[PDB]
Amino acid sequence: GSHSMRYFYTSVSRPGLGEPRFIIVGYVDDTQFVRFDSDAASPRMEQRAPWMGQVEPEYWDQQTQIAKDTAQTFRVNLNTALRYYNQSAAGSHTFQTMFGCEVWADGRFFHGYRQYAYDGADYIALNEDLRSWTAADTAAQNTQRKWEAAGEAERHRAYLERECVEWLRRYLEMGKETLQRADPPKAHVTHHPASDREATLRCWALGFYPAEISLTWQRDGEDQTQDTELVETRPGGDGTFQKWAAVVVPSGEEQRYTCRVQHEGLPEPLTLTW
Amino acid sequence: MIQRTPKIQVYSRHPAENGKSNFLNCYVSGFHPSDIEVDLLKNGERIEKVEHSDLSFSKDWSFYLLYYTEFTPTEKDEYACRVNHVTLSQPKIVKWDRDM
Amino acid sequence: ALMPGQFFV
Numbered sequence: 001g002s003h004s005m006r007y008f009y010t011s012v013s014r015p016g017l018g019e020p021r022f023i024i025v026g027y028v029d030d031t032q033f034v035r036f037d038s039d040a041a042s043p044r045m046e047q048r049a050p051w052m053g054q055v056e057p058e059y060w061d062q063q064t065q066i067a068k069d070t071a072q073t074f075r076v077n078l079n080t081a082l083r084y085y086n087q088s089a090a091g092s093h094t095f096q097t098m099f100g101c102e103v104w105a106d107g108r109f110f111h112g113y114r115q116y117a118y119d120g121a122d123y124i125a126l127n128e129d130l131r132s133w134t135a136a137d138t139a140a141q142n143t144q145r146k147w148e149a150a151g152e153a154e155r156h157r158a159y160l161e162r163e164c165v166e167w168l169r170r171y172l173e174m175g176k177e178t179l180q181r182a183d184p185p186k187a188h189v190t191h192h193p194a195s196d197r198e199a200t201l202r203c204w205a206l207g208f209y210p211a212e213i214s215l216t217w218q219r220d221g222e223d224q225t226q227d228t229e230l231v232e233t234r235p236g237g238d239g240t241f242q243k244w245a246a247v248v249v250p251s252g253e254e255q256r257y258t259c260r261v262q263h264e265g266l267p268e269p270l271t272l273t274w
Numbered sequence: 275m276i277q278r279t280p281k282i283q284v285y286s287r288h289p290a291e292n293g294k295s296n297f298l299n300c301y302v303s304g305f306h307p308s309d310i311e312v313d314l315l316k317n318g319e320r321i322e323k324v325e326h327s328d329l330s331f332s333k334d335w336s337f338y339l340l341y342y343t344e345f346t347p348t349e350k351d352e353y354a355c356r357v358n359h360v361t362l363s364q365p366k367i368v369k370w371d372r373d374m
Numbered sequence: 375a376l377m378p379g380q381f382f383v
Binding site: 163 | 375376377378379380382383
């Protein structure tokens with residue numbers, strides 16, 4: 001389908017205990033490929049996907065530098081927020097950004113974004129025209145005025161529309177053998193009594209990539225979603241994802257119920273029964 | 275400030291089979307702020323070797339982490355995940371159930 | 375990759 005590169009910064013202050021912590025994670029689609037964690041005597045941008053071995057060694061030095069500088073500005077930003085919101089120096093607070101670009105399967109750009117949060121709430125966001133801002137409150141309006149006066153939106157649009165897209169295409173090629181092979185789910189259903197009258201059927205989908213999936217129970221061929229328990233998609237730990245959907249049924253009625261598994265690595269949707 | 279209480283799912287990487295090595299996963303998500311303490315327990319006792327994914331977060335800004343360890347399930351050994359967070363009055367303990 | 379450039383709130 002489409003593809004994305006996404007970055008997520010987290011900055012957390014710790015009054016009394018030294019400098020804020022600062023973490024970057026970077027994703028292509030549903031696979032993390034880099035990390036930066038300031039909690040080291042000499043922190044480095046580090047690979048988190050093996051195809052990242054294909055970059056030039058300067059990449060790590062250059063990305064490490066940018067991570068370190070970004071950590072410094074977020075330590076200033078944390079302090080600035082204390083002034084904007086008239087908060088004391090005593091408590092720990094959080095800054096976050098996320099940004100990325102999206103691309104069709106053919107590599108054509110179609111969406112970029114950039115958003116900021118303070119203490120877990122929207123702070124300021126780049127609008128979808130990528131030329132204007134939405135401030136969540138009067139505190140953030142300070143930042144909106146600042147960034148409008150300084151034409152920051154254009155620097156954001158420059159990166160999101162060009163270098164973001166170019167690098168995304170380069171990583172997709174770099175990691176084609178994994179990034180672009182969809183692992184289909186390995187599915188199966190299990191049987192566990194509820195009453196002596198009732199039993200629960202659970203439909204498992206394991207080991208699939210990417211993360212988007214459709215797991216539904218049908219009774220007599222029509223969808224049953226007001227009686228299905230459906231856990232959130234969860235990581236396997238090896239880069240694959242997991243999900244299950246369950247439904248309680250009267251005894252004997254098992255052949256009425258079917259499980260429909262739709263996923264991009266499946267030539268056609270799977271149908272399973274007990 | 276916004277504060278969101280963590281969701282907790284405990285599960286194995288592959289379907290449990292007694293005597294076959296596996297990965298015990300505890301996946302905490304939807305929480306805020308990010309300070310959190312996660313222990314994996316074997317019969318009530320802390321497991322020393324535990325690792326976790328890099329701190330990330332979702333579209334609504336809330337954080338998630340995967341904690342995990344290699345283990346070999348048996349029939350008698352009970353496993354659990356113990357989570358502590360500012361939103362919780364005491365550590366929340368979610369037991370591992372190989373059927374979910 | 376990231377590019378240089380910093381944004382102070």
